[PDB]
């Protein structure tokens, strides 16, 4: 794996902002894309763009071999055993909110329980809060422990035979946890419920198996895994998805419309209404390909690497504090004593750092971790360890920087 | 208004299909893109990717003001009142969806009637009869007049005071009528009725005004105005926004996130949760730079000359039927005598040219219009009257053809 091959076919790494050489350490914010993607979107639209399925004419044809073709590479990718349970939406929050609407507002009574984790991100709480308001069940939380890790013992505890569907995040956007996803699926199971992954921070850096997980339902977002913006994949088995109904209706999803009555297509266009997002689904399978071609493994090895170095160089620092567990996924979220994260991420953008600050969409994890918002610097395959000393380098600037203009300003009082 | 030069920006209209020069008579289906909305994503991709939003870093900045940017064009390009009003979304279909399940699933009550017409397309008609399913309200239907127009007395007629939704397609995309909207939505309001635009084939081809229109919501898709797949817009009055509900829950459309209840950010990002479609949206805008410098009313001028022309030349033709009226959109929806639609497109498709087959997600229509299936050629602003040359001819020689095998084949029995 060669981090100067790969940083090369990224186009948009190669630039200064402010003076300085772009260090950009926001893929969980987003990830940049490889001349591989943005040229087949290029492609898409400078040679066989159309629209797709009753293929007649030679352009939709193409188009729609483009659109289904994709549809197996994304089954293959996350090991699902049919493009019947492959979905394709605008985005992990959009799978998410379809499981909460077809699923979960169809099979919850009084009694019935939705359990969540404190470190979810808000698309894997307002959907089941919702769901649970509008079906009278009751939304309960697993508690954490102290280094931001799930313990089996606790998911025992809080699961019950009136849970009837469990959802948490395989990886936290926030702490970099990555949490026992195929444990917590066999206790779910054994108490009769389904278990939700929201995948959006996992499938773009380490191999997904659904077979292996045994979870019910995966979502995940293409924009994170070099893929296009506006598109994601909601992953169900066929048995779950052949029982619910669409989440919304119009064209290409119907079989027969009359008056009054429908019937709706086979899985998986009976959730795909209206015109899909064809260019974007085709850019998201030359992202599959071209991580496959790196290899996921690779990929999350290189991470491994860069993380276990940023928290040992972050322990060089005084004055900050990392969250979350030692062992963990490419991110490092944290604060420094006495600035605030947002005046950080303003300093560092200034030396050309982008880095992210405020609740990162998971305010009950913040309220948590004691704090009102943190700083996180999150790393992907393009990224090097010189990256990660220009980053703690800067952060011991601005700790110098803010305690100089304080020592200033109160002398001058 | 010069063809030829509009026609050299359109890379895809330069190739051959089967040994012959496209002629890409499908439009209406979906737009082919001009050199400036391919090139904007690719400016995207190459140079300021960044999730938008809680701006810390220059790129996010970039990102953030090209995708808010964006939305300032589509409410200038519509002369909506406030960008509140202008929601993305992944498209029409989805547009019309969070309208029936935000505002008809909270306004219906038994008695109430939601009122569509027999020309309207699946994403216009469905979503109504789930709406109207769930709340126990009645679906009604506006008939048609012979030649596929509505009559006002027949709305006023239809529409009552129990009425409070009407629900209408702005252009059909079958008959190519152009409905009476802005005199509807004063029989809607007449009645205490919302009126619902579905605009997905106006918006297109002629300009947009919805403070004279007065339409409650229009709904549009990008990637029939030579924008990128994947994205729409849900315009919809602010008053009316301000108290409907999220379709969709998530990040990023929140203000205030607790352990069971949430608050929701003001307009427009009330209704996108997660990260948005940025640079689907981004290049929206473009698409809506290129046509203004066009003109709408030059290219609304362009297809009256392209329909007028094919509809005389239609009227050539021995043994082909033409459905709809005279004064019309750009597009012709048309049967040739005993020859199956989808077999007049393959062979068309033989002599390069691309037209669509089947019900155009209209079977009320259809059946209305006694057919089981039609085919149709759509025109926009980079065709010219010698493709329409090109279908009649074509047309013409399908006929002796399929003629020719019948004799053939009689009088080999
Ligand atoms: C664990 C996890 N779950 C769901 C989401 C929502 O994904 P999206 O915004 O692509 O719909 C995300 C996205 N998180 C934001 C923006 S992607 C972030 O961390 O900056 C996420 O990280
Ligand atoms: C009048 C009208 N209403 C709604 C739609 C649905 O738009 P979309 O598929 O972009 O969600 C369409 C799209 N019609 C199809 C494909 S765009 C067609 O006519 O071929 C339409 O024409």
Redesign the interface.
């Known amino acids: 794996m060669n981090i100067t091959d790969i940083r090369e076919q990224f186009?948009?790494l190669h630039?200064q902002?402010?003076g300085h050489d772009?260090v950009?350490l926001?893929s969980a914010?987003?990830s940049?894309?490889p001349r591989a993607?943005?040229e087949t979107?290029?492609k898409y639209?400078?040679?066989?763009?159309?629209?797709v399925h009753?293929g007649?004419?030679?352009?939709?044809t193409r188009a729609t071999d483009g659109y289904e073709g994709a549809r197996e590479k994304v089954r293959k990718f996350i090991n699902a055993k049919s493009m019947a349970e492959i979905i394709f939406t605008?985005?992990?929050?959009?799978s998410?909110?379809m499981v909460?609407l077809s699923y979960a507002r169809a099979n919850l009574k009084p009694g019935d329980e939705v359990v969540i984790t404190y470190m979810e991100?808000?698309?894997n709480?307002?959907?089941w809060?919702?769901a649970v308001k509008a079906t009278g069940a009751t939304?309960k939380?697993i508690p954490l422990q102290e280094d931001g890790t799930i313990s089996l013992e606790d998911v025992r505890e809080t699961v019950t035979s009136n849970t009837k569907i469990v959802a948490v995040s395989h990886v936290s956007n926030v702490l970099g946890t990555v949490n026992p996803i195929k444990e917590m699926a066999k206790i779910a199971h054994d108490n009769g419920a389904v278990i939700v992954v929201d995948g959006a921070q996992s499938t773009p850096h380490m191999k997904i198996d659904v077979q292996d997980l045994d979870c019910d339902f995966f979502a995940l977002?293409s924009?994170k895994m070099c893929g296009?913006?506006?598109?994601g994949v909601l992953y169900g088995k066929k048995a779950l998805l052949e029982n619910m109904e669409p989440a919304?209706?119009?064209?290409?999803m119907?079989d027969?419309?009359?008056?009054?009555?429908?019937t709706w297509k086979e899985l998986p266009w009976k959730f795909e209404?209206?015109?899909?997002?064809?260019?974007?689904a085709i850019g998201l399978g030359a992202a599959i390909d071209f991580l496959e071609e790196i290899g996921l493994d690779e990929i999350s090895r290189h991470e491994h690497k860069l993380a276990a170095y940023a928290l040992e160089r972050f322990r060089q620092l005084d004055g900050v504090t990392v969250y979350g567990p030692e062992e963990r996924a490419g991110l490092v979220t944290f604060n420094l004593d006495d600035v605030h994260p947002?005046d950080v991420?303003?300093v560092?953008?200034a030396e050309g750092?982008?880095?992210?600050?405020?609740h990162h969409?998971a305010?009950?994890l913040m309220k948590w971790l004691d704090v009102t918002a943190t700083a996180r610097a999150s790393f992907y395959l393009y990224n090097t360890e010189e990256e990660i000393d220009k980053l703690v380098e800067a952060l011991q600037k601005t700790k110098e920087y803010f305690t100089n203009v304080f020592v200033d300003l109160e002398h001058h009082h």
């Open positions: 186009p948009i630039q902002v402010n772009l950009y926001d914010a987003t940049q894309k993607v943005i979107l290029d639209y400078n040679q066989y763009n159309s629209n009753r007649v004419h030679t352009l939709g605008k985005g992990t929050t959009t998410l909110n909460a991100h808000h698309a709480i307002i959907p809060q919702q939304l939380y977002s924009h296009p913006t506006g598109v919304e209706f119009g064209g290409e119907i027969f419309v009359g008056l009054y009555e429908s209404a209206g015109t899909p997002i064809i260019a974007g947002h991420a303003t560092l953008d750092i982008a880095v992210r600050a405020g969409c305010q009950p």
